[PDB]
Amino acid sequence: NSLKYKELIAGELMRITHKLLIQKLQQQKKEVIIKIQEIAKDQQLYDTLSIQYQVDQKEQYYAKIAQSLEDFVSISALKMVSYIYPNISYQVSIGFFQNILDIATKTVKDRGALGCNYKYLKDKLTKALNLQQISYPLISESYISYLVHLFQDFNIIEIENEHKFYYKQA
Ligand SMILES: [Mg+2]
**Domain positions in the chain:** 3-93, 95-152
Alpha helices for 28-136 (secondary structure H): 36-39, 43-50, 58-74, 94-111, 118-129
Ligand 1 centre distance from Cα of residue 162 (Å): 23
Ligand 1 centre distance from Cα of residue 100 (Å): 14
Does 11 belong to an annotated binding site? yes
3-state class (DSSP) for residue 30: coil
Does 15 belong to an annotated binding site? yes
Ligand 1 centre distance from Cα of residue 157 (Å): 19
Does 111 belong to an annotated binding site? no
Does 74 belong to an annotated binding site? no
Q: Solved how?
A: X-ray
3-state class (DSSP) for residue 159: coil
Q: Which CATH number fits domain 3-93: 1.20.120, 1.10.132, 3.40.50, 1.10.10?
A: 1.10.10
Output the CA–CA distances (angstroms, integers) from residue 170 to 121, 136, 165, 167, in the order listed.
Answer: 33, 36, 16, 9
Distance CA 68, CA 39 (A): 12
